[PDB]
Amino acid sequence: GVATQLLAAYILLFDEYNEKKASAQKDILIKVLDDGITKLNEAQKSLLVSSQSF
Amino acid sequence: VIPWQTFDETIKELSRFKQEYSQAASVLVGDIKTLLMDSQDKYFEATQTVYEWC
Numbered sequence: 520g521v522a523t524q525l526l527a528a529y530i531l532l533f534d535e536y537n538e539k540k541a542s543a544q545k546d547i548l549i550k551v552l553d554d555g556i557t558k559l560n561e562a563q564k565s566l567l568v569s570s571q572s573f
Numbered sequence: 574v575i576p577w578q579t580f581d582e583t584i585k586e587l588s589r590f591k592q593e594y595s596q597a598a599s600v601l602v603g604d605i606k607t608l609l610m611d612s613q614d615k616y617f618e619a620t621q622t623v624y625e626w627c
Contacts, residue, residue, distance in 0.1 A: 570614060571614050573610075
């Protein structure tokens with residue numbers, strides 16, 4: 520729900536190169552993707568342990 | 574004149590043999606089942622990790 524709007528904001532703001540917001544857009548992208556990789560990995564490990572419990 | 578006690582002892586011995594070996598085999602087959610399911614979970618985890626890297 521957060522990622523599909525931040526990426527749409529990325530496509531909307533940078534149809535042309537806006538050099539003022541270029542130093543912060545990279546930090547926003549790195550922050551949201553490093554959050555997402557950690558959440559998806561923890562979800563997979565939780566589902567794996569729940570599968571191994573039976 | 575009718576040997577009934579020896580008949581009962583023979584029936585109880587031939588039943589106790591089968592009870593003992595059913596009790597001995599069931600636990601071991603139930604342990605092999607758990608090992609074969611844990612192996613499939615580890616196999617799925619390893620192949621999914623390599624697939625996600627590729």
